Design a protein around this nucleic acid. Structure first.
Ligand SMILES: [Mg+2]
Length: 214
DNA sequence: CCTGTGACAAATTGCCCTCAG
DNA sequence: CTGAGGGCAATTTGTCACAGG
């Protein structure tokens, strides 16, 4: 699929979006790059095509995901509103959106540091936290297509804005870690495992090690 | 403290059914 | 045929109360 290239800033940005909302942002960056005012646009047939949905169901996703963008902010470690104006359909099947102009810079490398991947790697993932992990792991991918990275549990909870109940490690393992690891080792070209780093009686970081299936 | 696990309810998800250009 | 709406049941995800170390 098209190859996405977002800055690590966003990749590490703290926010809470849905699958459909994230799928939507991918396309927003893409189209933006190969294009700023932020005034992007989305088509239902294309969307329905890329992600394999019926024209109808793709309409549900875009329409609901566009409302759920109201009031949501992005915190680049400076908080920013995703949109500055309500989305709107000028033509049947087409939606026009005004991404906060002030956000293009971040959505664009602006420097050597950045993250990239193809839509095929992340189009089969369902859990938005898993989409988050994958992208982060891709921030450490080497030309080989593998890597190893240690992440602070703290950082993960704060950036991925995980549910409060995942502050209790036994629940973070079950609902977040195990879940996202499997999802990736099944819906993406990545094959990964992990080791828990400890500080006596408590897990502090998570050591992720991954290698490309191909 | 810190773990793992069973219940439970709110969310999601892929389908299904209509209807107006 | 599209795509804008209205629903639905089966999973999932987010909480929490317990036993044990
Ligand atoms: Mg959907």
């Amino acid at each position: 699929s098209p190859r996405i290239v977002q800055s690590n800033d966003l990749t590490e940005a703290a926010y809470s979006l849905s699958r459909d909302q994230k799928r939507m942002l991918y396309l927003f960056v893409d189209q933006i790059r190969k294009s700023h005012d932020g005034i992007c646009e989305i088509h239902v047939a294309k969307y329905a095509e890329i992600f394999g949905l019926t024209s109808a169901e793709a309409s549900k996703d875009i329409r609901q995901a566009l409302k759920s963008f109201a009031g949501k902010e992005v915190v680049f470690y400076e908080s920013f509103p995703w949109f500055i104006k309500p989305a709107h359909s000028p033509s049947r099947g087409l939606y026009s959106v005004h991404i906060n102009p002030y956000l293009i810079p971040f959505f664009i490398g602006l420097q050597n540091r950045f993250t990239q991947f193809r839509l095929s790697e992340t189009k089969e993932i369902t859990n938005p936290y898993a989409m988050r992990l994958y992208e982060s792991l891709c921030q450490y991918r080497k030309p080989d297509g593998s890597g190893i990275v240690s992440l602070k549990i703290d950082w993960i909870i704060e950036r991925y804005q995980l549910p409060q109940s995942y502050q209790r490690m036994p629940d973070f393992r079950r609902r977040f870690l195990q879940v996202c690891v499997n999802e990736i080792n099944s819906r993406t070209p990545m094959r990964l495992s992990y080791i828990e780093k400890k500080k006596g009686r408590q897990t502090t970081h998570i050591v992720f090690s991954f290698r490309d299936i191909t």
